[PDB]
């Protein structure tokens, strides 16, 4: 219908202008807090900021998109047509590849366990343009239905299609698979370490309650068997604050020595419990509360704060991935099925709905850093305090 597509053509440009100004403002804020501080920046954060400037370069083009959607035809040249449609393509592959190497960096720092960062940034920015060279050469303002539009068309055989499919798979299916594999292994690693910290701590207290009400030596041996196995496993636990540190660090050696004392007090109580002594085994288990409160619970809450901080840190970049994979995914599926096949109101409506959905993503990323971000929110108040004087 002409009325429904005109309703979409009126809905698009002011949402485009609002998204342009909001994404532009939030992105300058992210950039200035990235540039004004260097001692706190991280490698994953270098990627996070590159995706930011990429959406700045995208956000400078929505005035042209708003003008062309308001006029109803590509008032511009075919040259600009590809100019814009490539900028959006390098935004897409910059987002995909930067989140892919964010996933690999977090896989290295979590599952497997910088002066050369600019070379890595220049590699990703280039690879995006390479996978966008097909977008640059395949899009030219043409004429259909009496109006000029900025859209790609497969016309005049083997080289074009071959490279198009190759680059497509290399930048989309391959990375996405790397991302879901790395993020599932990270989530399974961090949640198991939450479980291994808790269940080793759960049985070091629950079985201590069984000792005080056992009334014979038979249950004291079976309770202390589980606590010697729990304290041996909990000594082997590597916290994320000590995962990057050396295994022979002096901070870890105090944590291991507390479990070298705690198992030796289980061993003293097990030595009494095998002799049939029930009162002396419970009394030797009273010193197990003393050492836990002075060696282990000090390192339990330090590990339970660092591990949950990493879960808090991993939940904002997966949400950054999931927002990027909810906005920029259905628009590229629309532009792939149109080139694959070469009522009618539904196709034009779903084209424009995903057109404004993927273009919204330049606003949705500074939204996530302000809401569930743990580094941008603290340092945005830092630069606001230094200027409000």
């Amino acid at each position, epitope marked *: 219908l002409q009325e429904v597509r005109q309703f979409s053509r009126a809905f698009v440009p002011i949402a485009y202008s609002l998204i342009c100004v909001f994404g532009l403002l939030g992105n300058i804020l992210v950039v200035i807090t990235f540039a004004f501080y260097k001692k706190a920046r991280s490698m994953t954060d270098v990627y996070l900021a590159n995706m930011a400037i990429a959406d700045i370069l995208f956000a400078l083009t929505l005035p042209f998109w708003a003008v062309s959607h308001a006029t109803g035809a590509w008032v511009f040249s075919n040259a600009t047509c590809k100019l814009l449609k490539g900028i959006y393509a390098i935004n897409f592959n910059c987002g995909m590849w930067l989140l892919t190497c964010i996933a690999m960096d977090r896989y290295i720092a979590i599952v497997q366990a910088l002066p050369r960062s600019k070379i890595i940034c220049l590699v990703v920015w280039g690879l995006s343009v390479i996978i966008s060279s097909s977008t640059f050469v395949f899009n030219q303002k043409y004429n259909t239905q009496g109006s000029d539009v900025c859209e790609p068309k497969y016309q005049t055989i083997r080289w074009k299609l071959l490279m198009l499919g190759l680059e497509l798979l290399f930048g989309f299916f391959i990375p996405l698979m790397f991302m879901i594999f790395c993020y599932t292994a990270i989530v399974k690693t961090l949640r198991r370490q939450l479980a291994d910290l808790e269940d080793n701590w759960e049985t070091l207290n629950d079985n201590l309650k069984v000792i005080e009400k056992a009334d014979n030596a038979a249950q004291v*041996k*079976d309770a202390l*068997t*589980k606590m*010697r*196995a*729990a304290a*041996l*496993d909990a000594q*082997k636990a590597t916290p994320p604050k000590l995962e990057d540190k050396s295994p022979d660090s002096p901070e870890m050696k105090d944590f291991r020595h507390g479990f*070298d004392i705690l*198992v*030796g007090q289980i*061993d003293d109580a*097990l*030595k009494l419990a*095998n002799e049939g002594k029930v009162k002396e085994a419970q009394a030797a288990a009273e010193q197990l509360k003393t050492t836990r409160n002075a060696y282990i619970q000090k390192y339990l809450e330090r590990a339970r704060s660092t591990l949950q901080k990493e879960v808090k840190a991993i939940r904002v970049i997966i949400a950054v991935v999931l927002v990027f994979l909810a906005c920029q995914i259905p628009h590229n599926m629309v532009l792939l099925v149109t080139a694959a096949n070469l009522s009618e109101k539904l196709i034009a409506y779903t084209k424009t709905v995903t057109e404004v959905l993927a273009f919204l993503h330049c606003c949705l990323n500074p939204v996530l850093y302000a809401f569930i971000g743990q580094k941008f929110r603290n340092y945005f108040l830092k630069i606001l305090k230094d200027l409000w004087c």
Partner: antibody
Amino acid sequence: EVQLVESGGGLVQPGGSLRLSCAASGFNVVDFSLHWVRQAPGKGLEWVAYISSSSGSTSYADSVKGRFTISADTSKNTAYLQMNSLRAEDTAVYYCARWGYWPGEPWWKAFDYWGQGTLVTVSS
Amino acid sequence: DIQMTQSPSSLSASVGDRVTITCRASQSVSSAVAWYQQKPGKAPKLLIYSASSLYSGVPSRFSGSRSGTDFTLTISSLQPEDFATYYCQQYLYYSLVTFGQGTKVEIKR
């Protein structure tokens, strides 16, 4: 050169008594806990008893409790196993193995050096 | 108390093969599992201690792993001189030692 040498395994009657003298060399008794693992002919390894002569913590398996008595002395640097009221099920090859004290690495090396064993045949 | 279950009680392999013996603990035995090799008529010899660590004098083809209460001994390349019986043993405590039932590795024919 660290080694454990068993002796005293032989031929006894049911209900008899014999002492197996596991000697040692190259290391002392009070820095290594000595255990007895026996192996019946055609069967697997079964733990029997242990002693920690630095303190004295003689524990036994439930099949040998009361009848068996493990002992050691550090002047001669040997270990002993006094077995009484033997049945046909005690016919085995008796190994003595050393195992270090908690904490550190030598506790984790469980039974790193074994003795060659002595055969005890209990039959009427 | 704590039981030890060694699954492949008879194993047939040839020279150059890759072997895998699985031992499982009844309770939580927390990496306190050793592996032993015994030739017939001889004392056992420690191969892998602490469920993964390779003992000195043991060649690098032998290896160990732990996945919870499941434990695994692996020989990568099987030489003719390691046709013997293999025992797993939990050692959570001095008085708590229980061995596996034993797996004998024979020549494939």
